[model samples]
Target: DDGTRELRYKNPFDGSEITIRSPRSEDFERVSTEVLLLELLETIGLLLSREELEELIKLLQEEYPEWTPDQALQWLRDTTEKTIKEAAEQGWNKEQAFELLLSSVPEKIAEYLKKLKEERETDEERRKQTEEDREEWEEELRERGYTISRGGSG
Candidate 1:
């Protein structure tokens, strides 16, 4: 089939029309997490002045000496989640948490690190929950007369 699908939408606010084209077969294989991460950084980089962008990269290099773009993006996402949790724990509302996460300040980084450390303590609890869930599933299967088999790996 030819890739010629198109959709048009009218902009209600500005009285404008926009056309969206369907992706081609080549486009499917061209996408990856790395490409997406680079695009995200490129778009955000456009918002900063050259000097600020330079400083941003400098700080990132200093903090993550051997990190790839994908790793850095993942770190940003995880730290943002931790920052939001920290803000909530301190009784700040969602708006305050959003502001704190986007502030990109040293104090908030410290708070985020603290939250990270606290979350590390939850691993045992998480494992216990998983074990309980597995036991419940196994019990249900047993009641249905199903036998669970374990295979040894080489």
Candidate 2:
């Protein structure tokens, strides 16, 4: 719901008039039908990307049922205060953290991913050589075979 229908909001950024929307039936099925308010991007005109909009949708999904619009708005506003507190502790603001955070998406899996040990030990690419090596070792073992079983009378 656009915060303008009848309830007035003074422009904190600049001295300008604003308009808000009255909550309709569409607001009720927000999560099920359209969790994200991407449809209102043109009307709202806030500078956020598709990925950012998707993140907001995910947060809304997590905060559905129990929280209302006003409570959610309060939580969003509290984020700024929380960021200030965190900055006081870490000596860096939320914007800096968010910049790196957004950049660090879409990572890859590491080397040495799971596989069978025996197959890895024997190189299939050198199949003929591997087989020959195995045979040579077996032949050497055959040359050193012994029937002695630790008995004196055998």
Candidate 3:
């Protein structure tokens, strides 16, 4: 319940903002793999050509005959959960495990995922720098005999 915070990262492929929650410990305990699937599908949809998308869909349909879209989606979700759990047993985090799943994708898709991953890392660095700067500013004020108590109208 604690450490449930939102992370806003830019979509490196489309320049869109994507907001996700920092995974809570409870998330590792329960079924919360849908978000991973959503992001995967979104990346596929954005990067694949129309013919490629259709071909991928056809492959899925042929592999799992007579399955509706909903059924296929459920299967993907279950598969993602299973993979994540397996990765956890190997001491890998969820996101890291999810990347393992992505490792099988086409080269172009993999490159896009790498770019997105780098963008998220850059965002994290920016956040860390801002936090350190704020702390330094507060310390400077404290040394000058100014008491700064948080929580006021900014």
Candidate 4:
């Protein structure tokens, strides 16, 4: 529909009847754009400067060109939350992680996160195996009694 409707109103000072029309659709779009951008920033749980928000909006536009506005905002929200959580577990805070992730291509972000996860898992596996080896060595030592090594063994 065309973006205007007539409305009757009274002028407070003159007590005269008046009419008004809706603002332009472009104005409405700007208001909702701020609302969506601000909501996205709020959900991200970190401070984003105006420039940062602009950059993010541009990045989102490029990354999800086919998505609707709502879809793009939700995708950004989810991606930010997940990146923050995973990055925090590795000692990087939300701002640093989000900034870093946003600075990269979308596919690179996915690849980077996946690589970090694999590396962490490999480290955990190595630590677990080392711990098991130490336990086995201790168990063997306990089972085979040792003499105090003055010239002998302990």
The best candidate in terms of lDDT: 4
Q: Per-residue alpha-carbon lDDT of model 3 for 30-83, expressed as tens digits?
A: 222332354344332222222233344345555667865435445655655565
Clashing pairs in 3: none
Choose 1 or 4, whichever is better by lDDT: 4
What TM-score, computed on C-alpha atoms, does each candidate reach? 0.28, 0.27, 0.31, 0.33
What RMSD does model 4 have? 24.1
Compared with the true structure, the alpha-carbon lDDT of candidate 1 equals 0.47
Error of 1 at 102 (Å): 7.8
lDDT (0-100) at residue 78 of candidate 3?
61
Minimal lDDT window, size 10, model 1: 42-51
Candidates ranked by lDDT: 4, 3, 1, 2
Candidate 1 regions exceeding 4 Å error are 1-58, 94-154
TM-score of 3: 0.31
Off by over 4 Å in 2: 1-21, 24-58, 93-96, 99-154
Tens-digit per-residue lDDT, 39-124, candidate 1: 23323221112223224434555576786433444565455557656875898865566556556545534454334334434566
TM-score of 4: 0.33
Which runs in model 4 stand beyond 4 Å of their true positions?
A: 1-46, 49-55, 93-96, 103-154
Best by TM-score: 4
